[PDB]
Enzyme design. Structure first.
Site, PDB file in Angstrom:
ATOM      1  N   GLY B  69      41.405  32.025  39.496  1.00 43.27           N
ATOM      2  CA  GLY B  69      41.169  32.887  38.851  1.00 43.27           C
ATOM      3  C   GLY B  69      42.708  33.720  39.706  1.00 43.27           C
ATOM      4  O   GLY B  69      43.498  32.655  39.850  1.00 43.27           O
ATOM      5  N   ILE B  70      42.833  34.886  39.037  1.00 45.85           N
ATOM      6  CA  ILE B  70      44.009  35.414  38.274  1.00 45.85           C
ATOM      7  C   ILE B  70      45.096  35.533  40.110  1.00 45.85           C
ATOM      8  O   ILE B  70      46.315  36.164  40.167  1.00 45.85           O
ATOM      9  CB  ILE B  70      44.368  36.797  37.924  1.00 45.85           C
ATOM     10  CG1 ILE B  70      45.502  36.927  37.173  1.00 45.85           C
ATOM     11  CG2 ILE B  70      43.494  38.403  37.584  1.00 45.85           C
ATOM     12  CD1 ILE B  70      46.825  35.893  36.723  1.00 45.85           C
ATOM     13  N   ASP B  71      44.176  36.760  41.183  1.00 43.07           N
ATOM     14  CA  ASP B  71      44.543  36.901  42.156  1.00 43.07           C
ATOM     15  C   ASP B  71      43.420  36.756  42.929  1.00 43.07           C
ATOM     16  O   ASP B  71      42.698  36.847  42.758  1.00 43.07           O
ATOM     17  CB  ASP B  71      45.782  38.153  41.460  1.00 43.07           C
ATOM     18  CG  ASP B  71      44.585  39.382  41.831  1.00 43.07           C
ATOM     19  OD1 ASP B  71      43.344  39.349  42.021  1.00 43.07           O
ATOM     20  OD2 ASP B  71      45.438  40.587  42.201  1.00 43.07           O
ATOM     21  N   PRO B  72      43.735  37.199  44.077  1.00 44.66           N
ATOM     22  CA  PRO B  72      42.245  36.987  45.129  1.00 44.66           C
ATOM     23  C   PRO B  72      41.869  38.659  44.318  1.00 44.66           C
ATOM     24  O   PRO B  72      42.530  39.958  44.763  1.00 44.66           O
ATOM     25  CB  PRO B  72      42.675  37.346  46.741  1.00 44.66           C
ATOM     26  CG  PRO B  72      44.672  37.525  46.128  1.00 44.66           C
ATOM     27  CD  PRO B  72      45.213  38.420  44.458  1.00 44.66           C
ATOM     28  N   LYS B 134      46.320  43.145  40.066  1.00 46.17           N
ATOM     29  CA  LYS B 134      47.910  42.392  39.442  1.00 46.17           C
ATOM     30  C   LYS B 134      48.973  42.653  40.328  1.00 46.17           C
ATOM     31  O   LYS B 134      49.953  42.665  39.791  1.00 46.17           O
ATOM     32  CB  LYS B 134      47.634  41.961  38.302  1.00 46.17           C
ATOM     33  CG  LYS B 134      46.503  41.314  37.713  1.00 46.17           C
ATOM     34  CD  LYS B 134      46.858  41.491  36.083  1.00 46.17           C
ATOM     35  CE  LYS B 134      45.293  41.516  35.240  1.00 46.17           C
ATOM     36  NZ  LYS B 134      45.531  41.207  33.778  1.00 46.17           N
TER      37      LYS B 134
END
Lengths: 51, 221
Positions: B69-72, B134
């Site tokens: 995934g892109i971030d938590p 983000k």
């Protein structure tokens, strides 16, 4: 798309041809080499070579 | 304690604990984390600073898939990607849902990618500012690149969730790897409902003469 039933269906067929690996016409081999080219392009790299 | 190692950095959390497999990146990780940590520690973060790097204790040599995934989670991040320890976050409930349909188990209490053999769940960016997704992208940049490159030396398949998040992921890598960019489980129009990445990965692995992933092991009963 890379994520659809059709994508999954093409990849199984490619797996199927790879196991046989024992073609008997020009269309069979050109389907396989064509699937490999598509796989490579849709997913960047796969684990089988063009024959 | 025995495969594990430790290095010390000048900003919370001061000590980074890793599994041997991560050794060649650490020198740079340390260096980069020192340049940025001041700035990024100004904000409150998900997860807490003491959890930023807990996923560096996972071995890589036994890993064939990376589910990225892109971030938590903008809240309640545990430092282990996707993990919701009380099974509440949507993304993980929706993934558990895909795998119920696939493997046909309808009775489960929870689901966790981090227990599934041969999978490493990952976050491209290692924190976000609380509530904002983000938010720390600019801080993590050079590090995120360095860690993901390393992971892809060991995995056969990288699986990124987020079409728009990961549209240009190819750019971030040195050499190519089997890459699949699927829908985010919170995508519009139920698009993740009909996304079949979990089955696709398996076929791809079979094509690399690797063993498929047992997606059911991740259930918690």
């Amino acid at each position: 798309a890379m994520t659809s039933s059709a994508d999954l269906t093409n990849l199984k067929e490619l797996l199927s041809l790879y196991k046989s690996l024992r073609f008997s016409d020009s269309a069979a081999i050109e389907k396989y080499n064509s699937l490999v080219e598509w796989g490579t392009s849709t997913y960047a790299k796969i684990g089988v070579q063009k024959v | 304690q025995d495969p594990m190692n430790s290095v010390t950095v000048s900003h919370a959390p001061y000590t980074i604990t890793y599994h041997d497999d991560w050794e060649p990146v650490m020198s740079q990780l340390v260096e980069f984390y020192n340049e940025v940590a001041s700035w990024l520690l100004r904000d409150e973060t998900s997860p807490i600073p003491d959890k930023f790097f807990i996923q560096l204790k996972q071995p890589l040599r036994n890993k064939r898939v990376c589910v990225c995934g892109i971030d938590p989670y903008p809240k309640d991040g545990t430092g282990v990607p996707f993990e919701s320890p009380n099974f509440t976050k949507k993304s993980i409930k929706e993934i558990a849902s895909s795998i119920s349909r696939l493997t046909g188990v309808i009775d489960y209490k929870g689901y966790n990618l981090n227990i599934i053999d041969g999978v490493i769940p990952w976050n491209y960016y290692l924190s976000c500012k609380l509530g904002e997704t983000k938010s720390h992208a600019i801080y993590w940049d050079k590090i995120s690149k360095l860690l993901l490159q390393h992971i892809t030396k060991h995995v056969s398949v990288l699986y990124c969730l987020g079409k728009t998040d990961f549209s240009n992921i190819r750019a971030k890598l040195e050499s190519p790897v089997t890459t699949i960019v699927g829908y985010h489980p919170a995508a519009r129009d139920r698009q993740f409902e009909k996304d079949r990445s979990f089955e696709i990965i398996n076929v791809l692995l079979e094509l690399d003469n690797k063993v498929p992933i047992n997606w059911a092991q991740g259930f918690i009963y």
